[PDB]
């Protein structure tokens, strides 16, 4: 049941979910098969719980696939994160991939940075320090 979502995620976003992930505040969350109207309102729904949010929405096999990097106001466990997302999106935890982001990957940092600059993502809050430091420029 995890492999199937990983496969769909790579087909949809163009990269392995494992390229981005390694209680805590920072979590990478992929929610599968979400209702379009619900997904469109995710930004507003999750805002009261975070300090930072990076959100993308793309269609997949099952419906809308939400990919978001979140920094919560309060530290949370994987289970607590899933419960909160399920309440907001009406999707069970079995249709989610939730794992802490990689914090020492220049590739992962670059991914969030670039997609963040792009209008394809909905970003709010203060950008995490690790993304800024690891992003290579020149």
UniProtKB/Swiss-Prot annotation:
Subcellular localization: Host nucleus
Segments forming a coiled coil: none
Q: What is the effect of changing residue 89 to K?
A: Complete loss of SMARCB1/INI1 binding
This chain's function reads:
ATP-dependent DNA 3'-5' helicase required for initiation of viral DNA replication. It forms a complex with the viral E2 protein. The E1-E2 complex binds to the replication origin which contains binding sites for both proteins. During the initial step, a dimer of E1 interacts with a dimer of protein E2 leading to a complex that binds the viral origin of replication with high specificity. Then, a second dimer of E1 displaces the E2 dimer in an ATP-dependent manner to form the E1 tetramer.
> Which family is annotated?
Belongs to the papillomaviridae E1 protein family.
Subunit composition? Can form hexamers. Interacts with E2 protein; this interaction increases E1 DNA binding specificity. Interacts with host DNA polymerase subunit POLA2. Interacts with host single stranded DNA-binding protein RPA1. Interacts with host TOP1; this interaction stimulates the enzymatic activity of TOP1. Interacts with human SMARCB1/INI1 protein, stimulating viral replication.
Name of the protein this chain belongs to: Replication protein E1
Q: Which residues of the full protein are shown?
A: 210 to 354 of 657
């Amino acid at each position: 049941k995890q492999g199937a979502m990983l496969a769909v995620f790579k087909d949809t976003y163009g990269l392995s979910f494992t390229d981005l992930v390694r209680t805590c505040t920072d979590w990478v969350t992929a929610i599968f098969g979400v209702n379009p109207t619900i997904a469109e309102g995710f930004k507003t729904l999750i805002q009261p719980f975070i300090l930072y949010a990076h959100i993308q929405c793309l269609d997949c096999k099952w419906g809308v696939l939400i990919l978001a990097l979140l920094r919560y106001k309060c530290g949370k466990s994987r289970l607590t994160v899933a419960k909160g997302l399920s309440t907001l999106l009406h999707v069970p935890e079995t249709c989610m991939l939730i794992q802490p982001p990689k914090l020492r990957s220049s590739v992962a940092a670059l991914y969030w940075y670039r997609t963040g600059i792009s209008n394809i993502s909905e970003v709010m809050g203060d950008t995490p320090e690790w993304i800024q430091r690891l992003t290579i420029i020149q």
